[PDB]
Amino acid sequence: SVHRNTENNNPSIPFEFSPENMKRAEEVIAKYPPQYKKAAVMPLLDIGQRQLGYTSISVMNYVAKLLEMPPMRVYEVATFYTMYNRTPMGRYHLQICTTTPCQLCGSDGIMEAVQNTLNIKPGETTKDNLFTLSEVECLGACVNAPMMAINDDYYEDLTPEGTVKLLEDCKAGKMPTPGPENHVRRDCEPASGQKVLLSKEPHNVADFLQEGI
Amino acid sequence: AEIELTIDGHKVSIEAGSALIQACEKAGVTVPRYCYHDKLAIAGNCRMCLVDVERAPKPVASCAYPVAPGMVVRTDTERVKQARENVMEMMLQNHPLDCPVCDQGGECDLQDQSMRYGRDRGRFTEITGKRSTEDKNIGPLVKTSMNRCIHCTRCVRFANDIAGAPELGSSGRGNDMQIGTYLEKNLNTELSGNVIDLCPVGALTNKPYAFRARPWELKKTESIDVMDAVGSNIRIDSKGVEVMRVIPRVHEDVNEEWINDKSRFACDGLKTQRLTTPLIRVGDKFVNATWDDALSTIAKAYQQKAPKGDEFKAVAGALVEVESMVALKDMTNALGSENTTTDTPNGNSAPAHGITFRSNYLFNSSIAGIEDADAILLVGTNPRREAAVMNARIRKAWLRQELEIASVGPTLDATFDVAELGNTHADLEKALSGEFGEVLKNAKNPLIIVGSGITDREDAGAFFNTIGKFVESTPSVLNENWNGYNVLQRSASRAGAYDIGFTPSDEASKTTPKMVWLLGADEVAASDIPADAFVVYQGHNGDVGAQFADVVLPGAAYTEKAGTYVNTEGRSQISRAATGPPGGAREDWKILRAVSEYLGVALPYEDAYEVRDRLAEISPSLVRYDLVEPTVFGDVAVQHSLVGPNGSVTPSSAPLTETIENFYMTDSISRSSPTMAKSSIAFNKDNKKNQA
Ligand code: SF4
Numbered sequence: 050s051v052h053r054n055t056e057n058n059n060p061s062i063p064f065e066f067s068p069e070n071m072k073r074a075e076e077v078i079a080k081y082p083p084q085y086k087k088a089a090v091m092p093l094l095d096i097g098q099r100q101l102g103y104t105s106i107s108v109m110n111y112v113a114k115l116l117e118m119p120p121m122r123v124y125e126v127a128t129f130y131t132m133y134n135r136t137p138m139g140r141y142h143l144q145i146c147t148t149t150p151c152q153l154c155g156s157d158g159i160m161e162a163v164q165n166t167l168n169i170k171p172g173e174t175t176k177d178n179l180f181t182l183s184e185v186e187c188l189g190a191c192v193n194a195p196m197m198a199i200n201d202d203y204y205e206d207l208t209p210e211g212t213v214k215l216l217e218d219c220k221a222g223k224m225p226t227p228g229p230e231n232h233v234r235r236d237c238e239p240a241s242g243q244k245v246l247l248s249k250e251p252h253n254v255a256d257f258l259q260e261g262i
Numbered sequence: 263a264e265i266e267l268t269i270d271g272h273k274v275s276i277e278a279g280s281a282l283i284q285a286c287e288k289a290g291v292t293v294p295r296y297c298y299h300d301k302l303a304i305a306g307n308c309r310m311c312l313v314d315v316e317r318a319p320k321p322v323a324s325c326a327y328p329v330a331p332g333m334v335v336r337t338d339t340e341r342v343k344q345a346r347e348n349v350m351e352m353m354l355q356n357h358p359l360d361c362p363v364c365d366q367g368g369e370c371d372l373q374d375q376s377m378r379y380g381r382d383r384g385r386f387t388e389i390t391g392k393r394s395t396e397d398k399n400i401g402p403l404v405k406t407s408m409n410r411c412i413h414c415t416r417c418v419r420f421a422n423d424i425a426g427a428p429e430l431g432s433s434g435r436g437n438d439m440q441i442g443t444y445l446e447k448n449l450n451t452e453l454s455g456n457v458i459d460l461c462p463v464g465a466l467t468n469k470p471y472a473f474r475a476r477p478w479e480l481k482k483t484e485s486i487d488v489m490d491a492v493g494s495n496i497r498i499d500s501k502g503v504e505v506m507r508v509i510p511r512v513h514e515d516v517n518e519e520w521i522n523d524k525s526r527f528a529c530d531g532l533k534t535q536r537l538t539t540p541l542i543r544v545g546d547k548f549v550n551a552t553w554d555d556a557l558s559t560i561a562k563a564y565q566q567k568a569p570k571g572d573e574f575k576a577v578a579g580a581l582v583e584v585e586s587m588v589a590l591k592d593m594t595n596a597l598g599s600e601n602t603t604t605d606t607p608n609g610n611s612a613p614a615h616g617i618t619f620r621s622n623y624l625f626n627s628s629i630a631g632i633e634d635a636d637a638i639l640l641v642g643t644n645p646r647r648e649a650a651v652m653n654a655r656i657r658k659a660w661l662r663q664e665l666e667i668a669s670v671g672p673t674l675d676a677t678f679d680v681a682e683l684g685n686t687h688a689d690l691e692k693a694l695s696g697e698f699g700e701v702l703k704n705a706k707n708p709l710i711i712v713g714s715g716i717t718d719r720e721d722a723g724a725f726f727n728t729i730g731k732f733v734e735s736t737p738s739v740l741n742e743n744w745n746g747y748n749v750l751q752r753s754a755s756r757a758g759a760y761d762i763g764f765t766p767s768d769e770a771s772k773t774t775p776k777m778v779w780l781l782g783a784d785e786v787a788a789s790d791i792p793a794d795a796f797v798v799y800q801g802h803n804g805d806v807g808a809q810f811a812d813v814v815l816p817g818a819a820y821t822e823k824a825g826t827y828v829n830t831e832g833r834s835q836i837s838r839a840a841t842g843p844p845g846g847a848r849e850d851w852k853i854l855r856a857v858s859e860y861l862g863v864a865l866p867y868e869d870a871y872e873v874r875d876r877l878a879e880i881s882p883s884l885v886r887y888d889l890v891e892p893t894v895f896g897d898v899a900v901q902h903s904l905v906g907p908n909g910s911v912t913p914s915s916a917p918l919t920e921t922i923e924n925f926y927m928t929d930s931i932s933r934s935s936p937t938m939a940k941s942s943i944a945f946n947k948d949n950k951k952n953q954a
Pocket residue numbers: 357358359360361362364365366367370371372373410462463464
């Protein structure tokens with residue numbers, strides 16, 4: 050929650066934008082009123098996290114110069130949020146949930162299977178710059194309860210025996226899942242099968258009117 | 263337009279839309295708090311001003327609840343009496359056990375607050391314990407132990423909004439919240455040290471006065487700051503021999519309970535390089551001597567040199583007493599020579615404007631009028647440097663109302679938004695007729711503000727003659743109830759000196775003297791002094807002025823004497839003496855009395871009251887203390903300022919360079935104090951003091 054000025058993180062190390070990233074940032078700033086031109090400080094740094102793999106200090110200085118701001122506001126906003134990760138991580142960011150709905154369906158064995166297939170602590174990263182563990186709280190996918198998150202794709206409904214498959218799968222390079230779980234249910238469907246809404250067609254509101262319109 | 267309500271039976275009326283905590287202050291019912299402040303923005307972080315409100319489901323904070331009519335305010339509900347103990351107990355479970363090492367021992371607002379309303383016990387007895395926080399180096403001025411911080415936000419809102427250094431900030435959630443740059447970079451705004459009077463715990467405290475004393479040992483004395491044009495109303499904390507620290511006592515107009523940084527840490531030079539005995543030159547060597555022998559050498563070398571007229575140079579300095587300069591002027595003109603000149607370069611003449619018509623050398627609007635200001639322009643100055651209290655007023659005005667500032671001359675970094683115009687008096691004259699002859703005619707309560715550094719320039723008079731025309735030309739800037747011409751000084755005393763009539767004549771400006779009188783006045787050079795001149799220094803410490811001298815005279819500094827000072831506003835203010843003059847130093851005018859006695863000069867006084875009557879003779883506005891009068895002579899004063907230096911001054915293209923070299927190195931005490939040496943080195947373009 051602070052910064053060390055040692056190496057690869059300096060105000061002096063340079064950072065620029067890709068021109069596609071530059072044009073995208075210029076697209077984002079126009080979405081807001083020009084009086085609050087600083088109000089785009091959240092997703093703009095996101096673009097930095099897309100360009101450089103972690104939130105450096107240099108990207109924050111560059112955005113504060115870009116938005117005509119004192120740098121401490123950028124410092125505050127990217128400190129106050131979880132996702133702007135200020136340390137260099139591996140290629141694959143493990144975001145394994147720990148919250149009780151994930152836990153009651155056994156997220157413990159999930160994490161233990163991961164860090165026994167790897168050998169690292171939940172703040173520690175893999176020394177090959179491949180996998181970076183992170184425990185995280187309920188990511189909104191609570192119904193599909195044993196889940197996790199590769200960088201954007203939540204992987205759901207995991208058995209810990211089947212999970213270490215996915216772990217060494219991503220370790221091989223070119224093998225993630227398609228994005229959903231292990232091809233069971235769907236996302237909202239029951240574990241057995243679709244009970245309600247077994248109609249092939251949308252019933253229309255065109256007759257279902259108030260009659261006073 | 264006002265609202266009357268009931269706090270604990272006490273009916274009280276207050277202006278509408280205000281905060282409830284001010285109504286509690288007005289009613290006399292004391293409500294404790296941690297993060298309310300008058301001059302700051304309101305955040306309800308402290309949770310202390312909890313109070314019972316009829317038509318409220320829960321007790322609410324009194325700091326941010328707005329005043330509504332028909333209000334019944336109760337403070338002694340058992341729910342509220344429960345709540346205050348609750349919140350105190352919640353606060354005291356991560357604050358660390360530092361009460362015998364914390365600086366604010368008796369002055370911990372939290373602590374006295376936790377005696378009335380605190381719990382008996384505290385059931386922190388957890389095993390694995392409190393949080394803990396990094397050391398957080400900031401600078402050589404502000405001692406910092408962030409472990410004792412409670413995130414009361416009172417630091418950061420101030421340095422954000424009014425001090426204008428937005429480097430402070432809150433970083434992290436929960437107990438991972440910290441205060442400050444996590445670069446570990448140097449903070450500096452030109453009122454930097456004002457946060458250590460402001461953090462109510464000893465998280466931020468005083469670095470040179472770190473552990474030297476402790477606020478029940480202290481003798482307090484209300485007095486006046488010098489080395490500052492505003493003369494802020496301060497309080498001296500003294501153990502009884504030395505001077506421990508200074509804290510700004512509250513005053514509405516002149517400082518609004520703030521103080522300059524250099525005003526704060528100046529006590530170091532007040533105790534380390536002082537003149538303690540008279541030293542006579544042997545020839546490349548000073549030896550100390552009998553206090554008779556010094557003044558007898560003065561009389562003897564007077565009989566040797568014999569300056570019969572226009573050869574007795576008398577120069578005073580930046581932090582010198584009005585009451586002492588009275589004795590000076592009396593001695594020089596009973597001696598028979600008005601070679602009576604200021605320390606400033608281009609001080610060897612009159613300062614290119616009228617010593618008459620006090621408006622010519624004072625601040626003609628009120629400092630309170632700057633809240634009502636509209637659109638002003640600085641010339642030849644850095645008001646961030648000179649009178650940083652003024653800069654606080656400027657930034658408060660610029661945030662509050664809608665304003666327009668121009669800046670002509672040196673390119674400064676303001677806290678606010680400047681608009682530069684040029685670096686030439688021709689560029690200035692282009693700017694007056696360019697667009698602001700319309701704006702300042704348009705503006706309702708503007709002003710126009712002038713630093714004293716232009717007095718250094720020999721082309722000052724035409725520099726006056728343009729601006730003296732403009733005030734004459736525009737009746738908006740020159741109306742009855744205020745006057746827009748506003749000048750500042752670099753000292754707390756050259757305004758008082760210009761009340762004295764401390765100016766040489768045109769005849770007195772010509773002859774090289776034989777007997778130079780130093781009274782403070784550090785910034786003379788070897789060029790400003792004749793070769794064989796008799797150069798007796800009278801001061802408090804050892805500076806350049808004492809280095810050239812023949813005999814030095816230890817006079818008391820601004821602390822030890824019953825001083826009298828006049829700011830640029832014109833407030834005559836008493837400096838109550840906090841201690842006696844140490845060693846063999848004496849008071850200044852008492853020295854000048856004996857120096858008169860060993861000559862033929864008989865000063866008609868021997869006491870303080872007789873000086874007060876002589877000072878009433880020079881000007882009765884200086885015995886009528888600390889009450890600002892306006893000037894009924896606006897137009898005649900501006901016109902007489904115009905007519906004098908009219909035409910004869912030919913303005914060159916000299917660029918309007920900076921008045922001072924560094925802020926924290928001036929006035930013989932910032933050079934005396936080692937804390938301002940180490941302040942000076944850390945404060946120029948350093949990577950911790952840089953922004954990007
Ligand atoms: S601020 Fe310091 S002195 Fe005051 S209660 Fe806290 S630790 Fe003790």
